[PDB]
Point group: C3
């Protein structure tokens, strides 16, 4: 009925396990597209698994690092780590590559891409609120924490590459921002302003509208390419 009542239910959907699985699937799919990733999974399977954990949990690793917490604190969530490990195994080692074939099917892939953006926006907002809890007026800390929560492994791409034996120092995601990195920066500014009370909008409405923006952009970008 009411618009705000729909936004409250949208902003409170349980991300675990379905929306988190979509996040893991899309992120590990990107890993498999990277040069040498399939070869690495055969010769260095542990390093391949660690690369996938970076793609799945890099948001929490970077946020915890920025806030001076254990960078692997999120790995105490055993069910999430196991679910992400199952996604890595199925994408790289499923007989007949069947899991890859099913999730790469474009109608299914676009749904996973949309569900991942639901998770990203929730992570941005949680980063801002978590930083605010520790620093009531730490505007720059709120923005940094929300930014790495949304960008994820992209901001540590130079060292994700290093783990794979690759070194390309001529570029990085700060010097040249991809769209998700730049959109996460815009997002963390909006949620920080909403935390300041400067932006006259409820947190649920901002989550709903910014998620729709991300869904439309990413789905369009994915379908086009």
């Amino acid at each position: 009925l009411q618009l705000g009542e729909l936004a409250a239910a949208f902003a409170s959907v349980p991300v675990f396990p379905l929306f988190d699985a979509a996040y893991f699937i899309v992120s590990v799919l990107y890993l498999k597209y990277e040069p040498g990733a399939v070869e690495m999974s055969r010769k260095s399977p542990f390093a391949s698994w660690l690369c996938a954990m970076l793609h799945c949990f890099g948001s929490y690793i970077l946020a915890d690092l920025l806030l001076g917490e254990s960078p692997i604190h999120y790995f105490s969530n055993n069910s999430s780590v196991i679910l992400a490990t199952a996604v890595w195994y199925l994408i790289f080692f499923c007989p007949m590559n069947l899991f890859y074939k099913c999730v790469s099917f474009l109608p299914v892939k676009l749904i996973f891409v949309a569900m991942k953006e639901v998770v990203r926006v929730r992570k941005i907002a949680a980063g801002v609120h978590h930083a605010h809890h520790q620093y009531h007026h730490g505007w720059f800390i709120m923005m940094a924490t929300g930014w790495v929560k949304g960008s994820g492994v992209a901001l540590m791409s130079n060292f994700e590459q290093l783990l794979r034996g690759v070194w390309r120092p001529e570029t990085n995601e700060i010097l040249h921002m991809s769209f998700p990195t730049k959109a996460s920066l815009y997002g963390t500014v909006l949620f920080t302003l909403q935390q300041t009370h400067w932006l006259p909008v409820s947190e649920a409405n901002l989550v709903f509208f910014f998620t729709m923006f991300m869904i439309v952009c990413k789905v369009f970008m994915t379908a086009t390419h």
Copy 2:
């Protein structure tokens, strides 16, 4: 009148905002001299701003990292971050480059250089005292913390370069120490010995005399080159 009475007033001058501004101005001037820095400020303005934040607050980032605190804890000091951002903007984007012209004027630049050394020595001593508060007998932790507080961005120069898209691994400030890095190492040893009670001198007198040493050296080095 008394020498110790003058040292107490010298060692307690409010560094914010005037002495901190001089620190920011000199540090961002060095950034602008680095290869590709002006080009970077045009094409990648956010990364340019982040580079300037490293030059202005790298001392606190490194000390917080060494002590297991949030590496961006100092960015909760909104007024300092805003003042440093204003210095970055004026140095790189002032119409007619006027701010750069005024602060690069040698009589004015030597004053800024001298005021920066006041801030550096205070930061070294604060690092030693802060580490001591957490480790009453942690001599090596006191020396490490005082050292990075004084050296600043120099000790993370390899990764300041990486942010700019530069990689020169054949050298670093530990393998080949510049004068400020080496002088900060001598300084943190002196303040640690003063904390041990081994060195028979008041903390205010050591601040006054070591600051004068730094002022004379840096001013002379700056004027000469």
Copy 3:
């Protein structure tokens, strides 16, 4: 008399200072074998000393980093740092290179190598127990912490090389595990399972048997090469 009574005394031998000294000696010997290490000790003695501190305490640096503690927390143990510094000085600067000659004598070197493995296994188990204390069910955190405690400087070899002015990004100890790195991974899994209560064996018996495995392997590998 009883087997478990012998294991309790074996698993509780005081590692400081004799077993720790053997750890430092073997680790600094490996440092001296690295390319340019003797030259570095002459031209950059401070950086050489820091490299040796990484080889002696890298286990604690990495574990503290993973758990969000001060990475130099272990350097508050002044006696250990001083003992490690004495080993570095004697190995690189002893007149007539006499200390190197005595500890490189194969019968003596094999004893030091065996005593180092006693220290490594104790460090693995302590890492698992320390992580468990903070995360009662953090299986993945227990395994990560035990792993870096056992592997030591090997897992940060790329940045130990960087400190020396070397950059070889085409390989790392995760992508290509050496035997001690792989054995420490097996060890931390066993001690984690023993913490889970899944593995029906006492902690003292596991320490005794896994140490013997490491002693036999490393001594054999050292003697052979």
